[PDB]
Amino acid sequence: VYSYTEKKRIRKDFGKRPQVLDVPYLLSIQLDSFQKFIEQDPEGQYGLEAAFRSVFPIQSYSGNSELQYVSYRLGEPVFDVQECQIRGVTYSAPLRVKLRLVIYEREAPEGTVKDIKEQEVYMGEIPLMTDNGTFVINGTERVIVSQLHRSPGVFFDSDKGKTHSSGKVLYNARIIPYRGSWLDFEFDPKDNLFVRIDRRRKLPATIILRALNYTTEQILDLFFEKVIFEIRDNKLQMELVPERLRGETASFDIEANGKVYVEKGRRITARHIRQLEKDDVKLIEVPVEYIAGKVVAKDYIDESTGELICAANMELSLDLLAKLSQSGHKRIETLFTNDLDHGPYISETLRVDPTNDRLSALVEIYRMMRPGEPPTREAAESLFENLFFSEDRYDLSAVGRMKFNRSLLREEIEGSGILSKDDIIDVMKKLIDIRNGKGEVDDIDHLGNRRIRSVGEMAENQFRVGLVRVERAVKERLSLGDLDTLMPQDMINAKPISAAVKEFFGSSQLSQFMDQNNPLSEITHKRRISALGPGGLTRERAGFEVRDVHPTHYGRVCPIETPEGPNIGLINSLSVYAQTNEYGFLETPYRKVTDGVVTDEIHYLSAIEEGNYVIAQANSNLDEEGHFVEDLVTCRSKGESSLFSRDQVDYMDVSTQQVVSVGASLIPFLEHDDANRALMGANMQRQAVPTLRADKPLVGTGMERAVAVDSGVTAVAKRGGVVQYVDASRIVIKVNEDEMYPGEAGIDIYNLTKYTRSNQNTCINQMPCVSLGEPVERGDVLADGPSTDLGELALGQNMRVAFMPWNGYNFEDSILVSERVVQEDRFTTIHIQELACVSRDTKLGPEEITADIPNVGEAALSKLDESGIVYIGAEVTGGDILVGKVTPKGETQLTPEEKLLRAIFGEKASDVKDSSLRVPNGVSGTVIDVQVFTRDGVEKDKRALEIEEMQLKQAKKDLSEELQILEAGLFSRIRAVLVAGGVEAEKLDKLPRDRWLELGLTDEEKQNQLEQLAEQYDELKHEFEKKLEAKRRKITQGDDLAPGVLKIVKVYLAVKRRIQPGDKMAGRHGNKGVISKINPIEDMPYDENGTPVDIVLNPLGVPSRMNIGQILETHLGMAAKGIGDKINAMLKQQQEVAKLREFIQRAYDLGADVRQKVDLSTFSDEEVMRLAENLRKGMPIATPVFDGAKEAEIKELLKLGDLPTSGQIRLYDGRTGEQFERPVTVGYMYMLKLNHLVDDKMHARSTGSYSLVTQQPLGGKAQFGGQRFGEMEVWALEAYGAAYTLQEMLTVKSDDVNGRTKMYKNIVDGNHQMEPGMPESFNVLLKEIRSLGINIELED
Amino acid sequence: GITKASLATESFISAASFQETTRVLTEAAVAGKRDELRGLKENVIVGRLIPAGTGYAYHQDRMRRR
Amino acid sequence: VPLDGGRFATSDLNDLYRRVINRNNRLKRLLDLAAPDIIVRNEKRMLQEAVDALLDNGRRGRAITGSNKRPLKSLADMIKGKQGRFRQNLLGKRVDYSGRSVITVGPYLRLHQCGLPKKMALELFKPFIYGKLELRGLATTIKAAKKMVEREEAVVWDILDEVIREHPVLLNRAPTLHRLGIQAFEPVLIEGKAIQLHPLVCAAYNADFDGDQMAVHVPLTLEAQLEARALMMSTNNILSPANGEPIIVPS
Amino acid sequence: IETPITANFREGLNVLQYFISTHGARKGLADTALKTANSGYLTRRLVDVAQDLVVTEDDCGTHEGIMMTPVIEGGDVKEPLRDRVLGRVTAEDVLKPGTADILVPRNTLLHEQWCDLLEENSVDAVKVRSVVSCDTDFGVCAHCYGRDLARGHIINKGEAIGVIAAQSIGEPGTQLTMRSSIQVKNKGSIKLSNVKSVVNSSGKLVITSRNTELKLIDEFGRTKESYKVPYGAVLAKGDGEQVAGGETVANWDPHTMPVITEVSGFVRFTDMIDGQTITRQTDELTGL
DNA sequence: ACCGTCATGATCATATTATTACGCCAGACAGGG
DNA sequence: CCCTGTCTGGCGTCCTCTCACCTATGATCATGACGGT
Ligand SMILES: [Zn+2]
């Protein structure tokens, strides 16, 4: 079955793979993250409650006072979104917090407080998010973009090759906390082990192991095994486990049990290890040279002298053995220090250590942190407990503790946010294991190590920084005042909190201005995974590997949609199905392929769970049950593609659209384009502009409805029902009774957004697309937006294209367009500019907005009123006066003399300089909206009161229409109530509406229903009255302005541009081009029917720039228009619905096993005529991305129309009238106009303004400036022999002021001659070098 | 090498329009160095004719008339 | 200078000089105040660091900052760097009588001439048109001529075709790498807003037509018109200077 | 990657094949967008080292200049002499390859007509004047530069050659990338240079010099091939000999540095004592 | 309805701390066989 | 005393276009609204 707007124009759909998971709501990152941020969240985390429970309770400097936390609450915003964008306020909500003050007594902090106080306090204004997923910061709609950064936890990197220039790789182990001090263990080419803290000075690593109160005996107990030597009657025998001897060449003949096992000069084989462990050999015999370099573990003391025989971690010599042998020790514990197995890295590290106990280690750490100051044991304890071991200054998150347990092969993924002793010891153990040769290092670009922050987490962090500044302030004030007399709003102030969150949402590196000129550009700017910003890398520094697609971007981050230029691969865009995990990683759906059958359950895999399993590719053929029809199937195991067996697979992809993003899944035939041209096509499809009447894509991907509905430019129905009143302003839905609340009677009103300014100066319009009396379903479009049509997504328009070289006018990439295109007004877009005129107060006098202007004509002022502000709807050109404003200046130094002189003349003679607001140079259009903002306490002029009366009548009429049509629905429900149970058929409509609420009826649910509808009537009346008074007091009151500005007049122009030679058009595959000549109709190549082609492209761009998808799109577009022409022929002849049903059914079956399977036998002879009314301008065809329409299907659809099979029609010429040889390719391509127009780039300057510090011309176009004759152009004129051209190019034309006035006089008198002089900026160089101690001069 | 050779020139404006200006200006200042201009970029800085192209006749004339 | 509003956007050097003078006044008052040895040593040390921060900021330990954490720019940072005086105002300058627009093909051209729009032509050649208008006798004062071309009457287009005729212009594509990226043409006036550029010449500029832009420069004086015609004309650059291969090869 | 992309663009690429393609193309876009900075900074360093050098004389009055030969790596002759000595003024007068003839004089520019009369006579190599041998104080004389290159004649007195040279080297910086024995090919005559050799017992002329250059000279006089032959190699041929096309003429073992002799006699172990100097390692799998 | 008390906005000098995550490539410096 | 890791400074592409946004504060006279007589 189909929805009613899907019976308007049902898009033909090729495609073979039956879908199982539809496209999710595309704005779920923004909305779900910010819903996670601001919501009443119990059990501590996440949200604002994490900050308010981690920074509170603020306890004082031993004054026994404490400011603890209860709850919080956000009130309603004072301004809704529309008033906020008009006026210019933040769209914020006040954050009320309930804080409590307790004050303990003396001698008992475990005793009773004498007094508490709990109260409401105001702090900050956090800006809310609109339903589109955007913020309104100062009247401009902004987006905070997700950041891709390093996952907190341990990370074992390997500094490969480059250091020490000898190939010896290093290994470092960076512990990355979520908040606190970093910690980098590493090696050095002497194979010592070095710690460092926050990239500071370097210490040997075991100095922190003493700082955790480990003795050296315990350290060697941890980081090494033991070797036991027993002195038993002969040569100091040894306990020997032969696994240590795997490949070691002994120094003697190892024999045991009277049997020679190992010979001198040979090594111990594995089978000799098997012999020694099979015979269970324990004690062997060593020479005196065997313990010549064995390292003792623990301290041995002589019992007689009380001295030290040998210190811990010391090699043993002959005299040390002679000392400990005669002291009474039979057991000797040493360490095993092999070449391959276990290096003595800990032992060499302890030999570099000067420290000996806990105190000296804490002193050295306190000294490397803060250099050159006296340490104290209390200060060293406090610092080292506040580096890693305190809840305040150090905090791994749950993400950090998960990675730290997972990368150390733990079991519990839950732990504390602080470190411990076992954590650092396991980091050093894993680092030594990686150095020993077992285990692997961790790459950086692997997406199991890249977390995604979003709006909620970053706003929480900035709010937490605001709270730690305010806890500094509260710790200052709380124990330095008189208690009890104050309340907890005199202490805490809202300035740092609001400053922090307002600085983050106002100007950050990630809170950026929304590129809004297209529904696609909105919905793909909100889904952006930027690597830049705070905590990430920078563009001009890094690098190589991060600008490259890793093998685990498959289905998480799009590989082909990224901006080319200085940041490729850093401004990644997130894919279609890619959600975000609980912790912050990326996860993507799969289908659990149990042993034979592809089960239709979806199952979300992360980036590290994907690697262990084995995933089948998306388009693998399966026969109606899930059994894979091949016995070798293409899969990928551990980041590496291969060919696997039938039933060793564990997952299948969901749909074939999931590698790409929503920017590059609206490209039909994506699998035929080379990836560079698909990248450029997706980026230019983002850069489109909305035309005047957007049409549709004939060749789409079926993804248009998700991008249109799941964005916020269309007016989606909330509750379905029957339309009651359509208008260009509003749309009224009457809600069906099986969807309807019992109370609040309810018929919905959609106030559409008519012509208003977007951010990119386009024209964000909404047009109603429903008829009257029409049913609509829940979840359905009512009003099309900009670049939409019937709920689809129509960016550009589809035009008749031919690929042929045509007389050179399409030489490199150019495009040649018939005048039939510009006559049909089909690339005419609507822009809205917002010109502003401020009127301040100078210290020479205030400015005025009077209509009287000095030294202008009356014809220049006839477009103004009596008040000096332009009428609504007068077409102005460049230079017309919109706001007549003159500078209220002068001031002749006051005094009595001038005081009595001003009385004679009176008022102001002519002390008013002209500074009126004018139209910019070279636009046109219509004044559509004028606003007058005025500071309260200043006289409002006549047009200000006129606009106030206009808006007051508009608001009162609009709210009266709200109440009237709403109660019209309510009385129409009342009549439906009174007919059941006591009908008055003809009696009811005579007696008035007041006496419907108080007519009697039987006591049932019907009388309770009457009571409900009555109280809803009366409540809506009183609510109407109070909100009308509130709306009037909002309109009539003054407006906040900048300090020292009287009044602001804003005028909205609506320009209506067109096409010309120089604009940029482009298709959807990377075929760019400046349109080069707008030919007449007659010159176009026509065919043997009569129709001229509209656009003549260039064929030579196809074999080099390998975008072969545009030719398949051209042929399938011609097939679509062939079906549309046959429908137009079968309908223009007024044929009955039977033949239309026949032909539309044949055009909708037409293929292999497909997904569509429609039938027109359930459309009932009236929808088929309206469906053919919508198909007569062409039949829309869906072609999904990697499961598209093959060549034979395009041929069979070109055979259904009577078009030629090869797609090529022979074409005649327009000029000569004789045939082009070798018939050419025509069809329809869907081409987009880009907003790189030519009357926004063109600029010219003879002589304008000049800069102030260096007397050179200004830069830019808005400032009337000149083009930079840069350094390489100076080199290119040195490279010729052009010497006078360069002399006037950098002395006369640019800098020398007397030189250029002599030049201007000489040019207007006909004498081409230059008086050179000196550049004035060289004199600026002399003053800047001379302002140092340097004495630069000019000799002779 | 080319950056060590263009910074080691007998004309400190030629070696100051290029990389580090601090090192070259202190070396030229404490040496009391003097820049007999005589090249292309000194005359692009100071605003006169290039002594290569059309201006080579002008610099022949000026070098002859000293 | 103040920006648009009521406050003064002050430079960084005024912060540096104002701190040196504040500290120097404090040190004169202390040396006057007979303060002890510490006072004067910290005071003179703060003056030393203030002077050292004024001259070359940041060569000493972490550079001082006004707003917000970004360091403020000193005198040596007005000299050195990519944005000092050498690389930004003395080797490369911004230039009057210059223009810029999007290019397009126009294959009817001969290879010594390029298309140039009428609006750019009337803006770049305002003084020549003023001189021509004052020669004929149509107007009197300069003001009258500026009103005439501000209104764009019917007689200034003949004046414009009589100032164009034998007057070359320097077309320049924005990444100029070798000397064939600045070439001089003769204008042919274009109804339009896009520079029409002869196609063969495109292989010299590395200019396709996918949205490119070029700048036009006007040789003002008479020696510069002769250098544009005799050295930099597009007919004169038919061989690449790197070798012997022709650069006007058909593309 | 061991599994290729067997599908072209007219057939459809499936998902994995397009993803491997995107690896290969993202690397290229990152390389161009980061390569352009080094290309521009190279042009800047080059035009600021050049910056001064102006053609300022007409003859430095010298007789020195570099010896332009065709360059040969070991394959077929890569860049012919007419590409290197086109439009560069000769240092001394080139002798015709027959005997002691003044074929071209000693200060003639070699344009295309002179280079064709050089190619007819098969001239070996030309001693030509180079810019690095110019004796001009503060500039380059007009003959030691050469042809104008975009003008047919010699360089004019004045034209800045340092800047056009620096631009011409640094301008192709974008197109550049950023990130057993001897088998003869043709059929000609053998010649050896830097050779000190000896005949072995079998007859193959072995070489007692490491730095020996093996040239293959044709029947006309020009040098068509060149190779480097190590110390102690088995040459199948000898000096001045004629060979066939494809015949192996050299042989050696690089993993075994030959300590071959000049004379014969008996061998004594001088300062070779087993135990300290040398060691006894009897072979496992052979016994010798 | 006039007089006195609590509250709330102007002008004004006071003077600097608890983040890290480039990649060579010269050039100068304390350490040690 | 001649190698040597190690540390510190000094580079890192030109041209153009659009948009928004630049510390906090600690102390007090004088204006301004609220309540008693
Ligand atoms: Zn010379």
Side-chain angles (χ1 to χ4, degrees), chain A residues 883-956:
Chain A
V883 181
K885 178 178 72 68
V886 292
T887 87
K889 29 142 254 82
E891 220 243 81
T892 26
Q893 324 321 281
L894 274 30
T895 76
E897 282 28 51
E898 173 236 287
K899 203 192 165 5
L900 112 114
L901 196 164
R902 80 128 171 228
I904 327 148
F905 279 10
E907 217 206 11
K908 102 279 138 343
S910 148
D911 17 325
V912 177
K913 203 267 154 263
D914 186 351
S915 294
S916 61
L917 179 62
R918 292 184 182 178
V919 176
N921 195 1
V923 297
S924 297
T926 305
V927 172
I928 64 170
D929 192 73
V930 174
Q931 295 295 322
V932 178
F933 297 111
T934 304
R935 183 178 295 276
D936 196 359
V938 181
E939 176 182 0
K940 291 182 183 292
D941 49 353
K942 188 175 180 181
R943 188 168 174 83
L945 291 175
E946 199 272 336
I947 290 171
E948 286 179 351
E949 186 178 3
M950 183 184 288
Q951 288 183 356
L952 185 61
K953 288 175 68 175
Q954 180 64 39
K956 187 174 182 179

Side-chain angles (χ1 to χ4, degrees), chain A residues 328-344:
Chain A
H329 293 286
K330 301 294 188 291
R331 296 292 185 271
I332 293 95
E333 293 176 353
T334 57
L335 304 181
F336 179 68
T337 63
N338 200 357
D339 293 330
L340 292 176
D341 193 5
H342 303 293

Side-chain angles (χ1 to χ4, degrees), chain A residues 583-637:
Chain A
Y583 299 100
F585 296 103
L586 287 171
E587 64 187 3
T588 175
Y590 294 105
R591 296 173 68 183
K592 179 71 174 180
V593 181
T594 58
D595 55 356
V597 174
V598 176
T599 304
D600 56 353
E601 59 182 358
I602 63 168
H603 196 75
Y604 288 97
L605 270 69
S606 64
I608 50 175
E609 296 176 353
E610 188 184 7
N612 300 322
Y613 294 104
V614 41
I615 289 93
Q617 195 177 4
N619 46 8
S620 295
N621 298 317
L622 57 91
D623 195 2
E624 292 292 327
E625 293 288 330
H627 295 283
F628 292 94
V629 77
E630 292 91 6
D631 288 330
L632 57 90
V633 58
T634 61
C635 299
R636 62 187 193 277
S637 177

Side-chain angles (χ1 to χ4, degrees), chain A residues 46-220:
Chain A
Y46 298 97
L48 286 173
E49 289 286 334
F52 279 158
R53 291 187 188 276
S54 70
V55 75
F56 287 104
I58 297 167
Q59 57 186 357
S60 64
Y61 291 163
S62 180
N64 292 318
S65 298
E66 181 177 358
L67 186 65
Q68 66 186 358
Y69 175 70
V70 180
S71 177
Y72 76 102
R73 181 182 62 84
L74 281 93
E76 66 176 1
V78 299
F79 291 154
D80 51 354
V81 182
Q82 297 175 356
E83 300 291 329
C84 184
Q85 289 179 357
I86 289 169
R87 186 173 292 116
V89 191
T90 70
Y91 184 74
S92 66
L95 178 65
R96 304 288 183 180
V97 178
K98 292 182 183 291
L99 291 175
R100 186 184 294 169
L101 182 65
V102 296
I103 41 174
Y104 294 96
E105 290 183 353
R106 291 186 298 273
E107 195 65 28
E110 64 270 15
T112 311
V113 293
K114 64 179 182 182
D115 282 322
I116 69 169
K117 51 183 69 173
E118 175 180 359
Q119 72 177 1
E120 186 181 4
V121 71
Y122 180 83
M123 62 180 77
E125 291 183 354
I126 61 170
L128 294 178
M129 183 178 282
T130 321
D131 290 331
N132 296 325
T134 58
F135 292 91
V136 182
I137 299 302
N138 288 317
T140 63
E141 199 171 4
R142 303 184 71 182
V143 177
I144 281 89
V145 174
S146 301
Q147 182 185 1
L148 184 67
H149 77 290
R150 299 183 69 184
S151 178
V154 72
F155 185 74
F156 296 99
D157 195 359
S158 177
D159 195 357
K160 58 184 183 295
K162 276 89 172 66
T163 59
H164 192 264
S165 69
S166 296
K168 190 179 292 294
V169 296
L170 301 177
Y171 292 100
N172 51 0
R174 302 183 68 185
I175 294 171
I176 305 167
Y178 185 72
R179 181 178 62 84
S181 295
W182 292 69
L183 186 63
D184 301 335
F185 291 94
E186 64 184 359
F187 283 100
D188 267 337
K190 291 178 70 176
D191 292 334
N192 293 320
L193 189 59
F194 284 103
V195 76
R196 72 176 75 189
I197 298 169
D198 286 332
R199 302 291 294 164
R200 290 182 186 272
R201 292 179 64 249
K202 188 185 291 183
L203 293 185
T206 58
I207 202 165
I208 200 164
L209 292 179
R210 296 182 186 273
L212 294 175
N213 196 0
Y214 283 104
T215 55
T216 308
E217 303 175 353
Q218 295 176 357
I219 292 173
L220 295 178

